[PDB]
Amino acid sequence: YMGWWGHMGSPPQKGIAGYTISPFAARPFAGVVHAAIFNTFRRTKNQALFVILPVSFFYYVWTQASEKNEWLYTKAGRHELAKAL
Amino acid sequence: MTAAEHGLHPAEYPWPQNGMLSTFDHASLRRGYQVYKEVCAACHSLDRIAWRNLVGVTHTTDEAKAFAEELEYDDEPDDEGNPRKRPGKLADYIPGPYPNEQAARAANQGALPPDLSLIAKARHGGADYIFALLTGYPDEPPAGVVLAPGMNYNPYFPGGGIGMARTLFDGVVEYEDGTPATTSQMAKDVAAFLTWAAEPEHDERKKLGLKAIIVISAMLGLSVYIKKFKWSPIKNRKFIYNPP
Amino acid sequence: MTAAEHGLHPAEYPWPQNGMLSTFDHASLRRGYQVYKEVCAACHSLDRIAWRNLVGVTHTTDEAKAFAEELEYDDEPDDEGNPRKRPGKLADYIPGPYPNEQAARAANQGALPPDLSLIAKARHGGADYIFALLTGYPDEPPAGVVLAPGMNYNPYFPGGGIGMARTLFDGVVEYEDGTPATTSQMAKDVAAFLTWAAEPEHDERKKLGLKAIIVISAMLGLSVYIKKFKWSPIKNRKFIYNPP
Amino acid sequence: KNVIIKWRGKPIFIRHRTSEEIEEANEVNVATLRDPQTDDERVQKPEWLVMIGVCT
Amino acid sequence: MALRKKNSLLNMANSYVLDSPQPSNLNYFWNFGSLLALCLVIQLATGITLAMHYTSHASLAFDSVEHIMRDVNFGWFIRYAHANTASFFFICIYAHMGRNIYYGSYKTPRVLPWSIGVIIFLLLIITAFMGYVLVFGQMSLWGATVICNLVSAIPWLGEDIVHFLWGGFSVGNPTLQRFFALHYLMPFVLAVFALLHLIALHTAGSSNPLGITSNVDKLSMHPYYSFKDLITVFAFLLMFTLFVFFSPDKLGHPDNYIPANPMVTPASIVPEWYLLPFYAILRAIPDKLGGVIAMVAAILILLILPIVDRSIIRGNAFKPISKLLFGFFICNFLLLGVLGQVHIEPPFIVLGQICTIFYFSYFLILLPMVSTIENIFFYIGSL
Amino acid sequence: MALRKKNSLLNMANSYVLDSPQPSNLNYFWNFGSLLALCLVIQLATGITLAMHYTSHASLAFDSVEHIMRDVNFGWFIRYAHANTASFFFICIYAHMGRNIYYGSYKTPRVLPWSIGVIIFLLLIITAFMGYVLVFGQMSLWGATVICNLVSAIPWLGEDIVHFLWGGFSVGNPTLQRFFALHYLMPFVLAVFALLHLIALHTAGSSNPLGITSNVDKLSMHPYYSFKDLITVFAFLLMFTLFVFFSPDKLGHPDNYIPANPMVTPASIVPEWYLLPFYAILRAIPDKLGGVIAMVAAILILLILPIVDRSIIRGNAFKPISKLLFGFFICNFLLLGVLGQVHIEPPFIVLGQICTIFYFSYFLILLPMVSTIENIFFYIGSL
Ligand code: HEC
Ligand code: HEC
Ligand code: HEM
Ligand code: HEM
Ligand code: HEM
Ligand code: HEM
Ligand SMILES: CCCCCCCCCCC1=C(C)C(=O)C(OC)=C(OC)C1=O
């Protein structure tokens, strides 16, 4: 499924002109400030829920479990611990 | 588990060596050796430390040779193959108070005092645990605690009943530098010294790490510039498509 | 080098174990242990041999346990951490006559009697060298030989002057099987026993080798048939060339 | 007498040389010596030949 | 013809590191493969060095490690480098596997590099387990005891196999000396399999974050990915530096600075953090043999991802529901990790069981369902 | 298409061991390559096994080898197998190199496999040297001392390098533990180079005893050379059996059953038999540095065979004078071997010098002269 240079396995290409400039002719950090602020904000905003929802759920579950476990091994939690075992 | 089974967690004390750029205070190390020597060494060995280790950390070559030469160590047998003793040398290890575990336990109502060479690394808490433990014997155990025979109450020790009694009291040591030897001061010094004993590379390690951080950071910055420079023809590429 | 510097080369004696298919004579091994025990063990250790090693080679489990139980070995310290002795067990090693090299040399006018566990493999000649050496002390050194102090002339030993005197004389041992204990007989038995001590796998090794030889030979024969079978179309190939 | 002291795994030969031994050593003309040296260069005390007893 | 192409040896290097045609759009998650190669090189250099100063005999092992820390020049560095890089190796390998699962790297035509990858992961676990025993501190000994006793659950022959592995009736000197020899060997086996998975990959080439073919638009591996790999190498070295020089023991257990004592049992015997999720899965099943099977199955089930993923599209970039399920799967795997080191107490016992069910149901139910439905949504949605 | 050809991994195996096209007329001297592969496999299996029971610490090393002989089940076998196979490895490697020199295997287009081969030979020497030290008997120690002191001859830095290699001021525990680690590693390096020389060879294929092209008449490696290799495998195993089971110590030195003693020097320190010719060449030159250069040059001069052989024909099958010169060269190499273990006494001192001159003059004078003249005789003789 992959060839090599000269016969990579692409369907025939025609009609695309590609252009670029030398690394010495270009400013490598052109538009860096705009990218760092606006591009990163856009990219992050669009992925935020896919991190926030599972992390917040599993953190809440852990928090509840760890707090109950702590409470069961206090004096106050003696009776509830006795039932749990 | 109950908090008692875990032990009380020690406070985070501001040790001089806390801090990315901070060494040990070597004056405190020297004082802590003197606490080890005059209090702890009765029951605890420091077997991984040789006399040469003190030199240029806490003591001069001469002071450490003097400490070594006061002791007797096993020599190679004489010409008739009879056992012999010699005076200690800088290469010798600091000798422990007991010949074996059985003797150690017999002197300590069954408990075995651990060797202290690694104790700062072998306990959660490090220096803070050692300081908390030594200074955390309450006058009276909390009402309701039943101590096993030969046990002392100390909340920092897991379970609460430790076979080591309180040993540091104001003025059990007379420091040679004139520092007031309070319980707190001695505990701080000895905790520092034991932390040094567990990790004697500490000072050099952190300074080499400063050099590493600086070089590696510079190389990270330059690697970003170079990557962006080399990638700019790919990032800047533009296309015109005219469908055939 | 001079022949004297090399030592006289020992004769090749017909040992029972010489022979691809031959084991040790275990009756000779047993007798040789008794020579070791009553003559050599005064000066020479056998530190690589445990009591369990004798069992089912020279002695029964009970005889070997009896030998072990007559000795005292260092136990683990008691409850006050004081040293203790215990009777020997089959797992114990046969104990040597001296505590260290210095004691050994002091008892032997400076010479150190080697451990005998590997001596049959550690000397050119093996059993033949041990037999030749023990039986090759002339009554008088060849005229002109100057022996160093504490040396005895023995031509098999390189240089000629050995620090071990003759030790085997007719009837120094009384064999338990009624065999006449001549110098020659005792030297043969002890040389056999020491050869066993150096290579105790000897008997099993040679029998497994017999099985290997047979299987590997059969496989060699069959591999020749199979190769010839598979190659015959290539070997038998014929050509007709008609130049185009 | 010549002693053999282990020092860094290498043997050290220490000979307590007699008067006449020192004399015997001080005879050889330095000229005819693969490694030209007199005993005075070697020892700091004529009565204590201390050498690393490994052959060169 | 250029020498790099003409000469067969040079050409093999050339095909992997210079002319290798790569997609032009690999993101930074494609950089873990070279970080894993870096960890492997660090572990070989430091490991071979430690072997020059370590003694495998149980009477001397723990002290030889103290000798390394105290007397060997830069021994502390070599030891902490080796110990911390073992953790970094697992961070990189989880990242690399996570990348592979999110971007569908396991799908045809890359089933073979993925399947060999699963074995590389098992070899890493065994390598790291054996290396940890070598210290012969309390965690070393007690960890070896409990993990090697899981083999006793193999029916009929299990006990015999354990005694065979130990070379005796408990973990002792024979076990330590054999673990040294195998720990030395296993990294070489691992490097061979790492090479095999790359050779297998080279038939399709790297996948890319869009999940489409890159045959239309290739970039040479050098200089583009060479210089992009340097950025993460320096990021890695900065993290390495912060642990090795400033916090060398943060990832370890203090009990491993106590010499192994077969009599005293430590308060809590837990695996190294990177094995913790598998330990939680084992605890979830009450049966001994059940638990061992579940623990192994948790790794071998990765082999069925090529089957259970029914999607007509490779990877999650454009699949919002698959992305949410992936998020939950990853967070659950971290919860399992946390539950691996809590005490066997309420309510963590039941929670561990729920998390274990979720772990397996991802492969067996959810991914097949979600991938089926998204196929239908792409088709109906774009009509 | 057949799976063995289609799948890239299988195809690599296929290209070496099954479909590999071989000349149809390789004789039995082409079987040493597979015997060398067999020795390498035996040494890896036995060596890794010994490492499970050996202790590298100088206080325990010699005794751990006695423990192997006495207590480990089949330890005697594994130890003697490992020790004797080290000798068989050198018999096979000398045979293989002799084959290569007689049949012109070093000529174009096979300069690269030959040159890598010369390095494989140096790696074998270092591997075997370090392994011998590990026993820590008298020959182990004194051999290490004398051979490592040759490095002192390097000007200016030589002494410092020796102390660096030893990790101290004499051969001791640091030296033994580092030799263990490197002895474990070196066989893996050696296996990589063995693989590299084969890949390099695969561009031209095997040469053959006639020295002509075999492109006209090829035979698959399997089944023909597979089954032909079995015959010599069984011949080798019979020789192995006779040594390992019936005469396990014939090739060794009794002094290596005495524990290392830095004080007492053994009567005679000689190398293992397979190093003896190089030792004789070293003794021939009076200067220390001269002798070391000569000894190294004796191996590196193999690299110039492609240049100094001026023949228009590959190999000696049809060259009666070259065959006689080859016969003298080989017998001289065995004489050097014998002189390596005689005492430094008359008249062996001068004989060793003459044999050393003959050794070098083969490469530098005789082969260039004889190969030039035979070129002319073939041309004039067949006019
Ligand atoms: C005369 C006896 C004695 C003296 C003095 C003594 N100890 Fe101990 N120590 C013990 C015994 C016994 C134990 C073991 C307690 C147990 O395990 O129950 C112990 C335990 C410890 C522990 C480990 C507790 C743990 O977590 O396992 C530390 C740390 C310690 N000692 C430090 C010191 C320091 C620092 C000093 C003095 C400056 C000191 N000790 C003086 C007897 C002593
Ligand atoms: C009372 C002393 C003594 C007795 C009895 C004794 N030996 Fe020795 N033996 C020595 C001494 C001393 C040496 C060392 C001689 C030397 O190196 O100069 C030695 C050396 C040897 C050697 C090695 C010679 C060599 O090549 O290095 C063998 C073998 C040997 N003895 C065997 C025996 C056997 C077998 C017996 C008795 C059955 C025996 N010995 C009895 C004192 C003794
Ligand atoms: C020592 C461990 C490993 C090393 C050194 C390693 C190295 C690499 C490298 C250099 C690549 C190509 C670049 C990249 O995509 O990052 C790669 C690709 C890959 N690896 Fe790994 N890897 C290792 C372990 C694993 C494991 C454990 C798996 C699977 C469970 C795996 C599966 C893959 C897959 C499927 C790819 C192709 C991904 C793609 O490009 O789409 N590897 N690996
Ligand atoms: C994938 C490669 C490797 C991994 C993941 C790995 C992992 C480990 C781990 C986790 C330890 C325990 C470290 C500690 O806490 O002190 C360790 C110890 C050790 N490893 Fe490795 N290792 C690897 C390669 C090697 C190699 C190639 C060697 C070569 C011998 C080696 C030799 C050692 C030695 C001697 C120790 C014990 C000394 C010590 O604890 O530092 N390792 N290894
Ligand atoms: C080309 C491969 C090898 C060669 C030529 C080789 C050679 C040797 C030699 C000559 C000895 C001295 C044997 C003796 O007289 O007792 C030896 C010992 C040893 N070798 Fe190797 N060896 C090789 C591979 C290995 C490997 C891969 C290991 C893995 C660790 C290893 C481990 C050992 C050990 C532990 C010893 C010392 C125990 C003993 O003497 O038997 N060897 N080797
Ligand atoms: C571990 C050591 C080695 C192994 C396992 C090995 C293995 C092999 C094998 C399997 C072959 C192809 C079959 C054959 O011709 O016998 C071969 C060919 C060759 N080897 Fe080696 N070899 C080793 C060492 C050496 C050395 C030291 C040299 C050179 C100094 C060398 C030079 C060659 C050459 C030139 C060929 C091609 C010969 C021809 O077919 O004409 N090898 N080797
Ligand atoms: C010993 C075997 C280890 C195998 C890994 C060594 C190769 C070094 C990593 C280079 C690399 C490869 C090959 C690669 O294919 C690739 O493209 C996907 C990368 O960068 C994005 C890489 O970084």
B123 annotated as a binding-site residue: yes
Ligand with smallest separation from the Cα of E196: 7
Nearest residue to F220 (alpha-carbon basis) of F2, F13, F19, F14:
F19
CB count in 10 Å sphere of residue B215? 13
Give the dihedral of Cα atoms B198, B204, B210, B215; nearest 10 deg: -120
Are residues B185 and B208 located together in one domain of the fold? no
State whether residue C160 is helix, strand or coil: coil
What residues of chain B lie within 8 A of the CB of C79, using their CB? Answer: 102, 106
Any CB–CB contact under 8 A between B146 and chain E? no
Contacts of C98 in chain B (CB under 8 A): 81
* Pairing mode of beta strands E218-220, B161-162: unpaired
Q: Please check whether residue E270 is in contact with residue E279, taking contact to mean a CB–CB distance below 8 angstroms.
A: yes
* Gap between the Cα atoms of D45 and B160, Å rounded: 68
Q: Is the CB of E80 under 6 A from ligand 3?
A: no
Domain map of chain F by residue range? Answer: 1-383
Q: How remote is the CA of residue F136 from the centroid of ligand 5, in Å?
A: 12
Q: How far apart are CA F177 and CA F184, in angstroms?
A: 11
Instruction: Return d(Cα C50, Cα C52) in angstroms, integer.
Output: 5
Q: Whose CA is nearest to atom 7 of ligand 5?
A: F128
- The answer on C104 and C85 residing in a single domain is yes
Q: Do chains F and E touch (3 or more CB pairs under 8 A)?
A: yes
Residue whose entry in the numeric block shows the structure tokens 């196979």: F85
Contact indicator for E84, E240 with CB cutoff of 8 Å = yes
Residue F26 CA to its chain's centroid (Å):
22
Active site residue E272: yes
Q: Are B53 and B143 contained in the same domain? A: yes
User: C223 vs F70: CB contact, 8 Å cut-off?
Assistant: no
One-letter amino acid at F6 equals K
Residue F29: HSE in the Cβ half-sphere, 13 Å Cα cutoff? 16
Cα–Cα distance measured from residue F277 to residue F337, given in angstroms and rounded to the nearest whole number: 4
Which residues have C-beta within 8 Å of that of residue B225, sequence separation ≥ 6?
A28
State whether residue F377 is helix, strand or coil: helix
Environment class of E344 (CB within 10 Å of its CB; exposed 0-12, middle 13-18, buried 19+): exposed
Q: Give counts: helices (H), strands (E), chain C.
A: 8, 4
Contact E132, E90 (CB under 8 A): no
Does the annotation list C123 as a binding residue? Answer: yes
Q: Is B244's CB within 8 Å of A19's CB? A: no
> Are residues C166 and C209 both part of a single domain?
no
Interface test with B, best of E31, E68, E70 (most B CBs within 10 A): E70
N-term to C-term CA, chain A: 59
Residue F375 CA: distances (Å) to CA of C241, F193, F314, F317, F380: 31, 35, 11, 14, 9
Q: Do F263 and D10 touch (CB under 8 A)?
A: no
Whether chain E has a CB inside 8 Å of the CB on F178: the answer is yes
Q: Do residues D38 and D26 lie in contact, with contact meaning Cβ atoms separated by under 8 Å?
A: yes
Nearest CA in chain A to E334: A58
Beta bridge partners of F23: F218
What distance separates the 2 farthest-apart alpha carbons in chain B?
106
Q: Identify whether residues C139 and C241 lie together within a single domain.
A: no
Q: Are the CB atoms for F298 and F122 separated by under 8 Å?
A: no
Rounded to the nearest 5°, which phi and psi values hold at E18? -120, -70
Q: DSSP string of C186-241?
A: HHHHHHHHHHHHH-TTHHHHHHHHHHHHHHHHHHHHHHHHHHHHHHHHHHT-----
Please give the DSSP secondary-structure letter assigned to residue F268: -
Residue E370: what residue type? V
Which 8-state DSSP code applies to residue C95?
A: P
Angle, helix F32-51 to helix F221-241, in steps of 10 degrees: 60
Residue type, position B211, single letter: K
Residues C76 and C186 in one domain: yes
Mutate to test the interface with C, among B75, B80, B108 (most CBs of C within 10 A): B80
Question: In angstroms, rounded to a whole number, what is the distance separating the alpha carbons of residues F310 and F375?
Answer: 8
What stretches of chain C show up as alpha helix (H) in DSSP? Answer: 3-6, 26-38, 51-54, 61-69, 101-106, 127-135, 183-198, 202-235
E52-91 residues touching F, CB cutoff 8 A: 52-57, 60, 64
Q: How far is CA F205 from the centre of its chain?
A: 23
Residue partners of F283: CB distance under 8 A and separation at least 6? F291, F339, F340, F344, F349, F352
CB of residue F114 inside a 6 A radius of ligand 6: yes
End-to-end CA distance of chain F: 52
Minimum Cα–Cα distance from A49: chain E residue: E324
Residue A65 to residue A54: CA distance in whole angstroms: 17
Alpha-carbon gap: B199 to the closest alpha carbon of chain E (Å): 8
Look up the domain containing B65 and give its range: 4-200
CA distances from C132 to B15, C118, C123, F321 (A): 76, 17, 12, 52
Overall residue count recorded for chain A in this entry: 85
Q: Is B230 exposed, middle or buried (0-12, 13-18, 19+ CB in 10 A)?
A: middle
Given resolution (angstroms): 2.5
Structure-token pair, residue C228 = 């010839």
| Interface check C22 vs F, CB under 8 A | no
Kindly state the helix (H) or strand (E) to which residue F376 belongs, with its residue range: helix F367-382
The backbone region for B81, taken as left when phi is positive above 0, alpha when psi lies in -120 to 50, beta otherwise, is left
Residue of B nearest to E231 (CA): B223
Whole-angstrom distance, CA of residue E105 vs CA of residue A33: 34
- Collapsing DSSP to helix, strand or coil, A1 comes out as coil
Contact by Cβ (8 Å): C244, F248:
no
* β-bridge partners, B239: A18
CB contact under 8 Å between C106 and B81, yes or no, is yes
Q: Are residues B136 and B187 in the same domain?
A: yes
Give the H or E element holding residue D7: strand D2-7
Tokens read off for F307: 């240049």
Closest CA to E115 of E131, E130, E100: E100
Q: Which residues of E touch A4 (CB under 8 A)?
A: 21
- Do B244 and E281 touch, CB atoms closer than 8 A? no
Instruction: Give yes or no: residues C155 and C210 share one domain.
Output: no
- Nearest of E321, E358, E334, E323 to residue E102 by alpha carbon: E323
**CA-CA-CA-CA torsion sign (E67, E239, E96, E373):** positive
Tokens of E9: 């040896």
Same domain, C184 and C234: no
> Are C77 and C176 part of one and the same domain?
yes
Q: Are E121 and E97 in contact (CB under 8 A)?
A: yes
* Cβ contacts of A16 within 8 Å, gap of 6 or more: B239, B240, B241
Q: Are F209 and F317 in contact (CB under 8 A)?
A: yes
Q: Are E231 and B48 inside 8 Å of each other by CB?
A: no
Q: Does F219 touch chain C (CB under 8 A)?
A: yes
Question: Which residues, at least 6 apart from F227, have a Cβ–Cβ distance to it below 8 Å?
Answer: C223, C226, C227, C230, C231
Indicate the SS3 state at residue D15. strand
Q: Is F11 at the interface with chain E, CB within 8 A?
A: no
Closest CA to C90 of C63, C124, C120, C121: C63
Cα within 13 Å of Cα(C215), Cβ side: 8
Please tell me the total count of domains within chain B.
2
Task: Say if residues E79 and E65 touch (Cβ distance below 8 Å).
Answer: yes
DSSP collapsed to 3 states, chain B: CCHHHHCCCCCCCCCCCCCCCCCCCHHHHHHHHHHHHHCHHHCCCCCCCEHHHHECCCECHHHHHHHHHCCEEECCCCCCCCCCEEECCCCCECCCCCCCHHHHHHCCCCCCCCCCCCCCCCCCCCHHHHHHHHHCCCCCCCCCCCCCCCCEECCCCCCCEECCCCCCCCCCCCCCCCCCCCHHHHHHHHHHHHHHHHCCCHHHHHHHHHHHHHHHHHHHHHHHHHHHHHHHHHHCCEEEECCC
Q: DSSP character for A77?
A: T
Ligand 6 center to F229 CA (angstroms): 14
Give dist(CA C166, CA C172) in Å, integer: 12
Round to whole Å and give the CA distance between F17 and F37: 13
Q: How far apart are CA E27 and CA E221, in angstroms?
A: 14
| Contact C3/F at CB under 8 A | no
Cβ atoms F124, F316 nearer than 8 A = no
- Closest-approaching ligand to the CA atom of F140: 5
Q: How far apart are CA B126 and CA B9, in angstroms?
A: 11
CA atoms within 13 A on the CB side of B181: 18
Active-site entry in F56, F140, F206, F311: F206
Q: How far apart are CA F383 and CA F378, in angstroms?
A: 9
> Mutation test of the interface with chain C: which of F256, F258, F263, F341, choosing the one with the most C Cβ atoms within 10 A?
F258
Number of Cβ within 10 Å of residue F198's Cβ equals 15
Q: How far apart are the first and last CA of chain B?
A: 75
Q: Find the residue in D nearest to F168 (Cα).
A: D8
E39 CB near ligand 3 (under 6 Å)? no
Please state how this structure was obtained: cryo-EM
Long-range contacts of E38-42 (CB under 8 A, 24+ apart): E38/E233, E38/E236, E39/E85, E39/E88, E39/E89, E39/E92, E40/E89, E40/E187, E40/E190, E40/E191, E40/E194, E42/E81, E42/E82, E42/E85
**Which of E56, E107, E253, E272 is an active site residue?**
E272
Contacts of B59 (CB under 8 A, 6+ apart): B30, B33, B67
Rounded to whole angstroms, the Cα distance separating F279 from B118 reads 50
For atom 40 of ligand 4, which residue has the closest CA?
A: E135
Peptide bond into F368 cis (omega under 30): no
Q: Which of E70, E235, E257 sits opposite B220 (nearest CB)?
A: E235
Closest CA relative to residue F65, chosen from F165, F3, F137: F137
Ligand nearest to the CA of F26: 6
The whole-angstrom separation of Cα F148 and Cα F162 is 7
Nearest CA to ligand 2 atom 15: C163
Are residue B209 and residue B183 in the same domain, yes or no?
no
Which of B33, B164, B173 has most ligand 1 atoms within 8 Å of its beta carbon, as the pocket-test mutant? B164
* Same domain? C118 vs C215: no
CB atoms within 10 A of CB B208: 16
**Nearest ligand to residue F214 Cα:** 6
- Catalytic residue (one of E67, E163, E222, E228): E228
Q: Where are the beta strands (DSSP E) in C64-186?
A: 72-74, 85-87, 152-153, 161-162
What is the 3-state secondary structure of chain E?
A: CCHHHHCHHHHHHHHHHCCCEEECCCCHHHHHHHHHHHHHHHHHHHHHHHHCCCCCCCCCHHHHHHHHHHCCCCHHHHHHHHHHHHHHHHHHHHHHHHHHHHCCCCCCCCHHHHHHHHHHHHHHHHHHHHHHHCCCEHHHHHHHHHHHHHHHHCCCCHHHHHHHHHCCCCCCHHHHHHHHHHHHHHHHHHHHHHHHHHHHHCCCCCCCCCCCCCCCCEEEHHHHHHHHHHHHHHHHHHHHHHHHHHCCCCCCCHHHHCECCCCCCCCCCCCCHHHHHHHHHHHHCCCHHHHHHHHHHHHHHHHHHHHHCCCCCCCCCCCHHHHHHHHHHHHHHHHHHHHCCCCCCCCHHHHHHHHHHHHHHHHHHHHHHHHHHHHHHHHHHHC
